[PDB]
């Protein structure tokens, strides 16, 4: 097989292609992009078959959360396995690799692929996998095997080939195989060592034994083999470790030491809920200028990670930088994993071979949460509710099983111009003159279609929320979707064109703010609402001084486009729309911005119901957003503008947390140009992430297949 050339070639007896999920622990993308030629069998698979540049892991980048994420399609917070070592309050038990509690079905949530196959009339066998040796939802896989890390790989492969020798009735359709290397060698020496090469050569022979075995069984060109990894590897040193003793006078708390630290109380389960978690982050927030970590609360963490809604995730969490560790006391060598999944060193591998997959194709990077949807499509089975976008991975397959469709709108738009005179002043006034700008808001059929072409190129974001009373408001420079109930816009779409050298930019008009004649005063936001609240003040979603002359910016300064913002948050919001937005408009040759509020007080990752919202503006029914999104959209080819682009798009979304203090960025000593960009970049999320938090599906009028649009939806930009 290793000497053979690139080729369904399935023989009689086998009617459907079998799926094998090969896992090589700690096999980073760096290993495949540098040492691939040293691996004869793996190099023959990357050339003939299909492979990605890298496969994005899930935080924390460890075996048990990632392996179980691949088989379920759920985030660690949803499937329960948030860490290899964790504690449950309600069950009052400790989960550990050495403990017997690993076999307890109460820890394991969701439905893995092997069970999904069994519930749909397909047998599933497994030779090692975190969860396969556990009775998830009562049932066990058809051929499960109790874990033993010291078993030789040749015997593991031999028994898997023996399962394929079984007759059609007893013969399983789905398989999984786990390998400890090149992870064990990564901890022993490091990611750039001779030790990992020997382990990489050892996994190559192990994969070689499977392909050579399948060759004599005439299944090497029939089997849909998927060789992937859980995480990557990063070098560590005893000099590159942050000690907690240098931050606290006395340690009276339990900490999960390593790349993903979690602070918990010792007295459990009584003092768990009453433990002052917000105190620890406050005592760790920018204590040193050369600090190698950042303390975070569960909802304060970047939304893209999806690591908050689970009782096992301790409220106080630590975000350690690249190559650096965190320990409780003074009492390391080689390498480790558990860091941010966005990091280059934590990028896993993905390689596939078979008749279902496209031959000699190098696909773009994707998240492990999507593997479950692909596995279901390969086995011809309906998936269980997972967090992966079904249909996103159709570009990998020659013949896609699931054809995705656009998200159905559950709420119809129904605001209209009648007279330019306002019924109620709403305690707001502009010093400037007669009401001439009020008639400019009133646009004819042609003028509406003009702004629905320039500022709305991919169409209006459809409301996926049930009974959401909303109205569409049109302006010459921006189109917005006002939310009648929350008295603020859900979204605001506007295409900023490519500007000149622009050394001096026009400033925003101060003290000028009028009332909207289209929106009814009962559903309108009053300026007196922010008068009583000293902490929160009126902020505009769409910046007025971004398009046109001094007269044109009068449309934004109205009761509409007004959203509640903190005085400290405005420093991040205004600087981004005055310096950064223009800077990235030059690089992309114009940019389409879709911005709005996010309500996620229950930190589940989904949009909040009116009852779910806990904080409102002082003595008013207008809510306060938890986060604010900014979706920047352009094109892959820089020659075209977002208003008129034929081809593939380029996206840069954000989920900026709406916090009363900039304690996350730490603005002390640093000028706005040194921390605003850094925070936005740290809070970059997928288009699917903004969609789930708002209940607004984007890009529905874009002339491209639903499968191709989902690739942009799942896309996460990495710098
Ligand atoms: N199904 C399983 N059941 C129990 N233990 C397993 C199973 N699969 C793998 N393991 C064990 O989990 C290890 C991989 O876990 P990890 O890579 O997540 N953690 P490790 O390398 O020990 O170091 P840390 O950075 O977490 O300190 C393997 O080497 C096995 O010993
Ligand atoms: C889980 O294991 C930890 C130890 O790893 C246990 O923590 C101890 O809990 C007692 C109170 O019950 C404290 O006084 C000790 O200080 C804790 N130990 C350490 C090392 O800090 C915990 O009780 C275990 N939980 C269960 C349910 O087994
Ligand atoms: C994996 O190990 C477990 C625990 O040793 C085995 O489970 C036992 O199975 C027998 C029947 O074979 C039952 O009578 C026991 O009650 C089970 N114990 C527990 C704690 O579940 C299991 O059979 C082993 N599986 C394999 C494939 O070796
Ligand atoms: C990931 O998917 C799961 C399943 O679709 C979601 O979990 C469900 O969420 C609803 C609403 O909160 C609950 O009523 C269900 O009980 C949950 N089920 C399970 C098994 O957890 C989860 O919210 C999704 N997460 C994201 C980020 O999309
Ligand atoms: C558990 O198994 C039963 C079998 O009847 C099934 O109906 C149910 O959906 C399963 N639940 C999960 C969470 O897999
Ligand atoms: Ca929510
Ligand atoms: Zn691992
Ligand atoms: Zn490991």
PDB file of C-alpha atoms in Angstrom, residues 473-655:
ATOM      1  CA  UNK A 473     -36.128  51.495   9.236  1.00  0.00           C
ATOM      2  CA  UNK A 474     -34.412  52.865   6.078  1.00  0.00           C
ATOM      3  CA  UNK A 475     -31.825  55.705   5.871  1.00  0.00           C
ATOM      4  CA  UNK A 476     -29.586  56.998   3.008  1.00  0.00           C
ATOM      5  CA  UNK A 477     -26.347  55.787   4.722  1.00  0.00           C
ATOM      6  CA  UNK A 478     -27.598  52.834   6.925  1.00  0.00           C
ATOM      7  CA  UNK A 479     -30.425  50.221   7.209  1.00  0.00           C
ATOM      8  CA  UNK A 480     -31.455  49.082  10.741  1.00  0.00           C
ATOM      9  CA  UNK A 481     -33.859  46.559  12.322  1.00  0.00           C
ATOM     10  CA  UNK A 482     -35.552  48.216  15.333  1.00  0.00           C
ATOM     11  CA  UNK A 483     -36.779  45.990  18.184  1.00  0.00           C
ATOM     12  CA  UNK A 484     -40.092  47.607  19.316  1.00  0.00           C
ATOM     13  CA  UNK A 485     -40.229  45.689  22.658  1.00  0.00           C
ATOM     14  CA  UNK A 486     -36.622  46.439  23.817  1.00  0.00           C
ATOM     15  CA  UNK A 487     -36.864  50.065  22.416  1.00  0.00           C
ATOM     16  CA  UNK A 488     -33.498  49.699  20.521  1.00  0.00           C
ATOM     17  CA  UNK A 489     -32.259  48.195  17.160  1.00  0.00           C
ATOM     18  CA  UNK A 490     -31.383  44.454  17.021  1.00  0.00           C
ATOM     19  CA  UNK A 491     -29.021  45.124  14.068  1.00  0.00           C
ATOM     20  CA  UNK A 492     -27.614  48.000  11.934  1.00  0.00           C
ATOM     21  CA  UNK A 493     -26.193  47.243   8.438  1.00  0.00           C
ATOM     22  CA  UNK A 494     -23.948  49.822   6.666  1.00  0.00           C
ATOM     23  CA  UNK A 495     -21.216  49.602   3.973  1.00  0.00           C
ATOM     24  CA  UNK A 496     -18.361  52.092   4.594  1.00  0.00           C
ATOM     25  CA  UNK A 497     -16.447  52.733   1.288  1.00  0.00           C
ATOM     26  CA  UNK A 498     -12.614  52.808   0.878  1.00  0.00           C
ATOM     27  CA  UNK A 499     -11.460  56.224   2.261  1.00  0.00           C
ATOM     28  CA  UNK A 500      -8.503  58.376   1.133  1.00  0.00           C
ATOM     29  CA  UNK A 501      -5.408  59.303   3.190  1.00  0.00           C
ATOM     30  CA  UNK A 502      -7.814  61.041   5.704  1.00  0.00           C
ATOM     31  CA  UNK A 503      -5.265  62.498   8.258  1.00  0.00           C
ATOM     32  CA  UNK A 504      -8.085  64.695   9.740  1.00  0.00           C
ATOM     33  CA  UNK A 505     -11.514  62.958  10.186  1.00  0.00           C
ATOM     34  CA  UNK A 506     -14.862  64.818  10.760  1.00  0.00           C
ATOM     35  CA  UNK A 507     -16.004  64.731  14.438  1.00  0.00           C
ATOM     36  CA  UNK A 508     -19.425  63.692  15.851  1.00  0.00           C
ATOM     37  CA  UNK A 509     -22.032  66.497  16.386  1.00  0.00           C
ATOM     38  CA  UNK A 510     -22.323  67.120  20.192  1.00  0.00           C
ATOM     39  CA  UNK A 511     -25.550  67.913  22.194  1.00  0.00           C
ATOM     40  CA  UNK A 512     -27.645  67.194  19.023  1.00  0.00           C
ATOM     41  CA  UNK A 513     -30.264  64.399  19.479  1.00  0.00           C
ATOM     42  CA  UNK A 514     -33.895  64.453  18.170  1.00  0.00           C
ATOM     43  CA  UNK A 515     -37.013  62.150  18.137  1.00  0.00           C
ATOM     44  CA  UNK A 516     -38.029  59.497  15.537  1.00  0.00           C
ATOM     45  CA  UNK A 517     -41.389  60.220  13.817  1.00  0.00           C
ATOM     46  CA  UNK A 518     -41.736  56.654  12.339  1.00  0.00           C
ATOM     47  CA  UNK A 519     -41.418  54.836  15.733  1.00  0.00           C
ATOM     48  CA  UNK A 520     -44.408  55.275  18.138  1.00  0.00           C
ATOM     49  CA  UNK A 521     -43.559  57.137  21.446  1.00  0.00           C
ATOM     50  CA  UNK A 522     -44.780  54.085  23.477  1.00  0.00           C
ATOM     51  CA  UNK A 523     -42.103  51.930  21.702  1.00  0.00           C
ATOM     52  CA  UNK A 524     -39.506  54.796  21.548  1.00  0.00           C
ATOM     53  CA  UNK A 525     -36.457  55.321  23.835  1.00  0.00           C
ATOM     54  CA  UNK A 526     -36.493  58.614  25.854  1.00  0.00           C
ATOM     55  CA  UNK A 527     -33.306  60.647  26.552  1.00  0.00           C
ATOM     56  CA  UNK A 528     -34.472  61.203  30.192  1.00  0.00           C
ATOM     57  CA  UNK A 529     -33.874  57.423  30.769  1.00  0.00           C
ATOM     58  CA  UNK A 530     -30.060  58.005  30.768  1.00  0.00           C
ATOM     59  CA  UNK A 531     -30.366  61.243  32.848  1.00  0.00           C
ATOM     60  CA  UNK A 532     -31.060  59.343  36.141  1.00  0.00           C
ATOM     61  CA  UNK A 533     -28.458  56.587  35.409  1.00  0.00           C
ATOM     62  CA  UNK A 534     -24.949  58.090  35.903  1.00  0.00           C
ATOM     63  CA  UNK A 535     -23.062  54.844  35.032  1.00  0.00           C
ATOM     64  CA  UNK A 536     -24.887  54.131  31.707  1.00  0.00           C
ATOM     65  CA  UNK A 537     -25.312  56.790  28.952  1.00  0.00           C
ATOM     66  CA  UNK A 538     -26.830  56.952  25.411  1.00  0.00           C
ATOM     67  CA  UNK A 539     -24.566  55.484  22.708  1.00  0.00           C
ATOM     68  CA  UNK A 540     -25.115  55.216  18.938  1.00  0.00           C
ATOM     69  CA  UNK A 541     -24.766  51.804  17.194  1.00  0.00           C
ATOM     70  CA  UNK A 542     -24.099  53.397  13.776  1.00  0.00           C
ATOM     71  CA  UNK A 543     -21.403  56.156  13.914  1.00  0.00           C
ATOM     72  CA  UNK A 544     -22.784  59.432  12.400  1.00  0.00           C
ATOM     73  CA  UNK A 545     -19.430  60.818  11.126  1.00  0.00           C
ATOM     74  CA  UNK A 546     -18.427  57.872   8.842  1.00  0.00           C
ATOM     75  CA  UNK A 547     -20.266  58.620   5.528  1.00  0.00           C
ATOM     76  CA  UNK A 548     -21.125  61.849   3.694  1.00  0.00           C
ATOM     77  CA  UNK A 549     -20.933  65.539   4.721  1.00  0.00           C
ATOM     78  CA  UNK A 550     -21.891  67.434   7.969  1.00  0.00           C
ATOM     79  CA  UNK A 551     -25.611  67.536   6.953  1.00  0.00           C
ATOM     80  CA  UNK A 552     -25.906  63.766   6.113  1.00  0.00           C
ATOM     81  CA  UNK A 553     -24.889  62.618   9.661  1.00  0.00           C
ATOM     82  CA  UNK A 554     -28.170  64.086  11.128  1.00  0.00           C
ATOM     83  CA  UNK A 555     -30.029  60.753  10.450  1.00  0.00           C
ATOM     84  CA  UNK A 556     -28.092  58.833  13.180  1.00  0.00           C
ATOM     85  CA  UNK A 557     -28.665  61.504  15.905  1.00  0.00           C
ATOM     86  CA  UNK A 558     -32.284  60.433  16.685  1.00  0.00           C
ATOM     87  CA  UNK A 559     -34.216  58.298  19.325  1.00  0.00           C
ATOM     88  CA  UNK A 560     -33.570  55.266  17.029  1.00  0.00           C
ATOM     89  CA  UNK A 561     -29.983  53.791  16.750  1.00  0.00           C
ATOM     90  CA  UNK A 562     -29.609  54.599  20.528  1.00  0.00           C
ATOM     91  CA  UNK A 563     -28.346  51.700  22.723  1.00  0.00           C
ATOM     92  CA  UNK A 564     -27.315  51.662  26.474  1.00  0.00           C
ATOM     93  CA  UNK A 565     -23.529  51.994  26.955  1.00  0.00           C
ATOM     94  CA  UNK A 566     -21.174  52.381  29.949  1.00  0.00           C
ATOM     95  CA  UNK A 567     -18.889  55.481  30.098  1.00  0.00           C
ATOM     96  CA  UNK A 568     -15.807  53.178  30.168  1.00  0.00           C
ATOM     97  CA  UNK A 569     -17.227  50.941  27.354  1.00  0.00           C
ATOM     98  CA  UNK A 570     -17.649  54.056  25.110  1.00  0.00           C
ATOM     99  CA  UNK A 571     -13.802  54.412  25.097  1.00  0.00           C
ATOM    100  CA  UNK A 572     -13.613  51.016  23.266  1.00  0.00           C
ATOM    101  CA  UNK A 573     -16.759  51.558  21.090  1.00  0.00           C
ATOM    102  CA  UNK A 574     -15.999  55.139  19.881  1.00  0.00           C
ATOM    103  CA  UNK A 575     -12.228  54.551  19.257  1.00  0.00           C
ATOM    104  CA  UNK A 576     -13.048  51.454  17.141  1.00  0.00           C
ATOM    105  CA  UNK A 577     -15.517  53.432  14.938  1.00  0.00           C
ATOM    106  CA  UNK A 578     -13.129  56.472  14.695  1.00  0.00           C
ATOM    107  CA  UNK A 579      -9.669  54.854  14.174  1.00  0.00           C
ATOM    108  CA  UNK A 580      -9.876  51.026  13.674  1.00  0.00           C
ATOM    109  CA  UNK A 581     -12.959  50.796  11.335  1.00  0.00           C
ATOM    110  CA  UNK A 582     -11.365  53.277   8.854  1.00  0.00           C
ATOM    111  CA  UNK A 583      -7.946  51.474   9.184  1.00  0.00           C
ATOM    112  CA  UNK A 584      -9.474  48.072   8.218  1.00  0.00           C
ATOM    113  CA  UNK A 585     -11.667  49.687   5.483  1.00  0.00           C
ATOM    114  CA  UNK A 586      -8.439  50.651   3.575  1.00  0.00           C
ATOM    115  CA  UNK A 587      -6.995  47.067   3.904  1.00  0.00           C
ATOM    116  CA  UNK A 588     -10.271  45.451   2.656  1.00  0.00           C
ATOM    117  CA  UNK A 589     -11.219  48.202   0.052  1.00  0.00           C
ATOM    118  CA  UNK A 590     -14.497  49.102   1.800  1.00  0.00           C
ATOM    119  CA  UNK A 591     -16.235  47.218   4.651  1.00  0.00           C
ATOM    120  CA  UNK A 592     -19.871  46.194   5.431  1.00  0.00           C
ATOM    121  CA  UNK A 593     -20.602  46.520   9.182  1.00  0.00           C
ATOM    122  CA  UNK A 594     -23.565  44.754  10.884  1.00  0.00           C
ATOM    123  CA  UNK A 595     -23.669  45.740  14.595  1.00  0.00           C
ATOM    124  CA  UNK A 596     -26.157  45.222  17.450  1.00  0.00           C
ATOM    125  CA  UNK A 597     -26.743  44.152  21.084  1.00  0.00           C
ATOM    126  CA  UNK A 598     -26.335  40.705  22.732  1.00  0.00           C
ATOM    127  CA  UNK A 599     -28.344  39.567  25.791  1.00  0.00           C
ATOM    128  CA  UNK A 600     -26.854  36.492  27.547  1.00  0.00           C
ATOM    129  CA  UNK A 601     -27.224  36.861  31.358  1.00  0.00           C
ATOM    130  CA  UNK A 602     -27.706  33.068  31.803  1.00  0.00           C
ATOM    131  CA  UNK A 603     -24.382  32.664  29.802  1.00  0.00           C
ATOM    132  CA  UNK A 604     -25.827  29.696  27.781  1.00  0.00           C
ATOM    133  CA  UNK A 605     -24.658  31.131  24.426  1.00  0.00           C
ATOM    134  CA  UNK A 606     -28.253  31.701  23.194  1.00  0.00           C
ATOM    135  CA  UNK A 607     -30.449  34.878  23.008  1.00  0.00           C
ATOM    136  CA  UNK A 608     -32.235  35.904  26.247  1.00  0.00           C
ATOM    137  CA  UNK A 609     -36.036  35.959  26.670  1.00  0.00           C
ATOM    138  CA  UNK A 610     -37.497  39.163  28.345  1.00  0.00           C
ATOM    139  CA  UNK A 611     -37.614  37.251  31.705  1.00  0.00           C
ATOM    140  CA  UNK A 612     -33.978  35.982  31.255  1.00  0.00           C
ATOM    141  CA  UNK A 613     -32.615  39.600  31.288  1.00  0.00           C
ATOM    142  CA  UNK A 614     -31.517  40.614  34.850  1.00  0.00           C
ATOM    143  CA  UNK A 615     -30.093  44.157  34.357  1.00  0.00           C
ATOM    144  CA  UNK A 616     -32.082  47.139  32.958  1.00  0.00           C
ATOM    145  CA  UNK A 617     -31.411  50.942  32.734  1.00  0.00           C
ATOM    146  CA  UNK A 618     -32.204  52.678  36.119  1.00  0.00           C
ATOM    147  CA  UNK A 619     -35.987  52.835  36.676  1.00  0.00           C
ATOM    148  CA  UNK A 620     -36.824  51.920  33.032  1.00  0.00           C
ATOM    149  CA  UNK A 621     -38.030  48.867  31.020  1.00  0.00           C
ATOM    150  CA  UNK A 622     -35.158  49.256  28.450  1.00  0.00           C
ATOM    151  CA  UNK A 623     -32.658  46.330  28.904  1.00  0.00           C
ATOM    152  CA  UNK A 624     -28.832  46.394  29.219  1.00  0.00           C
ATOM    153  CA  UNK A 625     -26.815  44.207  26.762  1.00  0.00           C
ATOM    154  CA  UNK A 626     -24.230  41.705  28.086  1.00  0.00           C
ATOM    155  CA  UNK A 627     -22.170  41.943  24.853  1.00  0.00           C
ATOM    156  CA  UNK A 628     -22.066  43.996  21.596  1.00  0.00           C
ATOM    157  CA  UNK A 629     -21.389  42.432  18.178  1.00  0.00           C
ATOM    158  CA  UNK A 630     -19.592  43.902  15.125  1.00  0.00           C
ATOM    159  CA  UNK A 631     -19.644  41.818  11.908  1.00  0.00           C
ATOM    160  CA  UNK A 632     -17.146  43.093   9.306  1.00  0.00           C
ATOM    161  CA  UNK A 633     -17.813  41.677   5.802  1.00  0.00           C
ATOM    162  CA  UNK A 634     -15.778  42.198   2.581  1.00  0.00           C
ATOM    163  CA  UNK A 635     -14.453  39.933  -0.258  1.00  0.00           C
ATOM    164  CA  UNK A 636     -11.555  37.424  -0.702  1.00  0.00           C
ATOM    165  CA  UNK A 637     -10.399  39.429  -3.768  1.00  0.00           C
ATOM    166  CA  UNK A 638      -9.461  42.975  -2.581  1.00  0.00           C
ATOM    167  CA  UNK A 639     -10.265  44.446  -6.087  1.00  0.00           C
ATOM    168  CA  UNK A 640     -14.045  44.462  -5.290  1.00  0.00           C
ATOM    169  CA  UNK A 641     -16.109  46.423  -2.696  1.00  0.00           C
ATOM    170  CA  UNK A 642     -18.670  44.715  -0.314  1.00  0.00           C
ATOM    171  CA  UNK A 643     -21.602  46.668  -1.913  1.00  0.00           C
ATOM    172  CA  UNK A 644     -20.943  45.008  -5.327  1.00  0.00           C
ATOM    173  CA  UNK A 645     -18.941  41.690  -5.063  1.00  0.00           C
ATOM    174  CA  UNK A 646     -19.495  38.547  -7.206  1.00  0.00           C
ATOM    175  CA  UNK A 647     -17.298  36.054  -5.389  1.00  0.00           C
ATOM    176  CA  UNK A 648     -16.356  34.591  -2.065  1.00  0.00           C
ATOM    177  CA  UNK A 649     -16.608  36.844   1.035  1.00  0.00           C
ATOM    178  CA  UNK A 650     -14.154  37.613   3.901  1.00  0.00           C
ATOM    179  CA  UNK A 651     -15.570  37.964   7.437  1.00  0.00           C
ATOM    180  CA  UNK A 652     -14.165  39.416  10.746  1.00  0.00           C
ATOM    181  CA  UNK A 653     -16.856  39.177  13.517  1.00  0.00           C
ATOM    182  CA  UNK A 654     -16.549  40.387  17.160  1.00  0.00           C
ATOM    183  CA  UNK A 655     -18.419  39.756  20.488  1.00  0.00           C
TER     184      UNK A 655
END
